[PDB]
Amino acid sequence: AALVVDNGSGMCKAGFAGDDAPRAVFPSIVGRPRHQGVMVGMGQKDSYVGDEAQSKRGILTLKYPIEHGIVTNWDDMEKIWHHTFYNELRVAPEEHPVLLTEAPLNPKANREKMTQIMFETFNTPAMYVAIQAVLSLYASGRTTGIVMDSGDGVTHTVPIYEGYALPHAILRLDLAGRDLTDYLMKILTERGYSFTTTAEREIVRDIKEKLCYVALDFEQEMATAASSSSLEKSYELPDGQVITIGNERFRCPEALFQPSFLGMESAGIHETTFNSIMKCDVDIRKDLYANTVLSGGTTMYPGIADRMQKEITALAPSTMKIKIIAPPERKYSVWIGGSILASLSTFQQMWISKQEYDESGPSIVHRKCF
Amino acid sequence: AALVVDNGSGMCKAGFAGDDAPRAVFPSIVGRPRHQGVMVGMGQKDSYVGDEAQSKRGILTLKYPIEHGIVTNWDDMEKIWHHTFYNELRVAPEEHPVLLTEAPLNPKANREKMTQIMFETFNTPAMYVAIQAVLSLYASGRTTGIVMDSGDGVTHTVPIYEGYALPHAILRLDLAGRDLTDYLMKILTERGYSFTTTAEREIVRDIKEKLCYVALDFEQEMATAASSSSLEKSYELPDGQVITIGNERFRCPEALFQPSFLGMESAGIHETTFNSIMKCDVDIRKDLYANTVLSGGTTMYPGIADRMQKEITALAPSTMKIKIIAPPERKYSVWIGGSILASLSTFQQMWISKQEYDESGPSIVHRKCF
Amino acid sequence: AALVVDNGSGMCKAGFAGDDAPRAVFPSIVGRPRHQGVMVGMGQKDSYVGDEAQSKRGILTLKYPIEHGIVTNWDDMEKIWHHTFYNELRVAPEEHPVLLTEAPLNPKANREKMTQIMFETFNTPAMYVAIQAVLSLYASGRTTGIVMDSGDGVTHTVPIYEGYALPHAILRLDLAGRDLTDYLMKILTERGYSFTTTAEREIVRDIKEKLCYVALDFEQEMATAASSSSLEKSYELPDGQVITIGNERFRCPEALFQPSFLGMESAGIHETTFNSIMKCDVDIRKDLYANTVLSGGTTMYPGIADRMQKEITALAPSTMKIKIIAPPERKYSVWIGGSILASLSTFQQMWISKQEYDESGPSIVHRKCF
């Protein structure tokens, strides 16, 4: 059974090949205590990783090891992988090959560092590394299409063809879940709620996942929200306080389609998807339009499928047909696609064996698995 | 002439447009006698507002109507404004327009009640609300730079590239002069001095204003103070006792650059300036670096400009040059900038007329003012 | 066989590590005669300390060497420790380490002289100085909760979450049982009983320890006490006189919740605990509401637990469940908690050895103890 570990900026999913759901899904944070300890004999640890950090997040400084898709701290990344195998999964990687997932347009330094870290610290027998966006379409069951990969890192639009990522057609986008979370607390201060610390950032993320939604029409919804109190909903903080949000429900997710709210010159995810398609060839343009698949936790807002379809329809020519595919399992689309690829019989051919790694060195990752 | 009232968390300044200095500067405190009146010869008013309460602060419970730039008690705020117009400025508000100041990233209800009070209690012909940090740049004769304002409640960094401030790059911290005063009396107990009541709080503020200074090198200065003498200063209390403070002279201002002493996860006043600049465009970063402006009473410590320059230089790339501008009259920079704006002929069309407020109610303050 | 000495403002409890109750408990008063002896046969001494002073309290002038948790007379403090070790415990401190307790937010010079005196007059092998509130949580066996330690001179609240204390949320109030005793004798003159001398203060303290109680509703109980005589109780003075106290039973403990009676501006103990919790983070507030711990002799009034629960519930959000822990042995919680600390195997690495003190001096206690 080959492990399928999908590291991510927000959450990392781990499990086994052939399963339909990840075994362990915990936040990818590494918190350290900022206060000195007074009670002796408790055996308190120095660093808390995963669910332990979230439970005790009040007295910790939560730092995300991965920011904007690049690992800014390679010492904390080893801590999370160590916690994934021994603690959450309780399986020694000595007898199980490990599958890792990259990000589109990843620097070559990260590619070799991931191979070097695991082949020595964990010494797994075999490895294969694949693109997260590529695996997103594999879970949906189609090999050709354009993936609107979004998450807590950076939004990527990768129009893969025949299971291969087009390198020139990939368009980056920094609009992600973290930006909306930071933007939500900036506009929540207008009602008198002040969330500033990193511990309270997790609280805002819970609000975004439960109450926020995408409105079909922004101008129509704005007038309705001001006139009537129907749109207001109540949320309860961990301390017992009750808060009310009236029109922030459809104003924070709207920043995806209108980045000018955050002050970014780049266009929204509706126009980036259209721009990426235009970069591809004319003949294969027909197939990509009808096989667009959303992925990641950012695209889980209610009504985002309808808003995206309507707005991309106007930009696209009237001859083109739009079919936004939004599977309900799109949160774990990256992991599920990885499990499908690992379980394949022909997948044994492109393993990176431990014996082959020593003779070739860390540079084998560039040419073997691409 | 147009009255320019700059209500502040600690002190409020009121005057006339075109003047070079505020006419009246008194503390923004409202006190009520906790003890029972025993004599009948004198008036023995219910409450005292301004410097009247400061003189009799022994027998009163001083309460600040403004906390962190938000008016917590609107009953006491009406007392202060009634005292400003009728006792200090001794003018009728019914004939002169009034210009007010509000901190950025404030609750919408804070400036909505300000419009309602002005147009219903004092019947001012016109009104306007302006950002405190924006006016601080006008007093220095600049229209392109970053303003580091710091008072009693708010310490906000507002990068202003043009006549209008950049909204997406505004950073606000709830660490200011009042927070340092509470920290100064906490570490003063280490030497055996106990200041608890609000009347004793005003004594600590005098000590902070006269003896505290920012050390260029905190680690080196702590070792120097460990050798005793050459750094202890003597202060005389209103009772008559003489107190000596050693390393507390620079420890209290050091909480600005190291907020971890107060248990706040927020970054220091030096990092929050660099972070604010990083949110702007690449082309504009060159101008903002060389046009940094300090303002407010908190930044009046001896040597804060020198210390701030060193900290920013290490964080900023060595190619860029850092020039911190510290005008001699930066205490009244907020009011002086407002005087220039009010006296401008173009500003006559930006006033909110009485008829305009009636047709739209208090909500017009959000759409017109900024 | 570590000694655990818990010196307090009123009573000092000294015993042995590993036991369940203090070995010797005697009042911490040092009294000297104000007359001149006439009989030469009797072996009169110079000063009387401990239970000996209480027996002859009618002649001596009782003086408390500890005031508000601060040793105001170091000459007398040595006498109590000299009497404790060689008369009550009857052990030599030259072979056993000594554990001492000190209130938080105390002058740094207080614990500096504590280390110097024992290490030079008694020559103890080791030392450790612990916060009184921290030890109180050890007795309960818990690890998370806000501890209210109301003693004889100091009322302080120290919140602790998962063994990590929060130094910025510690609130200290200089209002405790001794101040209530001073207030009780002030209102006892309203009935015709005059207690002025320091010897008669101990008589008032005996009245408070037996008859005073905390009323659930002060406004309702005040009317009832003035309309009937069911609340009146009779107490017998040492001289044989019988006194009757009515509404003063629930008025003296009422100064804890309404310090305005004493003329102080500080908030009540119910508001101080709530203010301490509010200083903490949002995520840890839920666990601190359900783990409130009371200790000290001041919190032994009948019904103080019920009154505190009602008062906090009004301030706290309705959704939260306030659970106040009132163990029957909360009087000796500080000592019992210190017994567990001294007997722990992990604690043997935190003793302040003689060699460590020799190389540095009295300042070693600052960097080795919280």
């Binding site: 008198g192 709620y193 002040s194 969330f195 903080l237 | 906390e67 962190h68 917590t72 609750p107 409640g153 | -």
Partner: peptide
């Protein structure tokens, strides 16, 4: 404030 801080 309402939720957070004291203001």
């Amino acid at each position: 404030w309402x939720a957070x801080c004291p203001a």
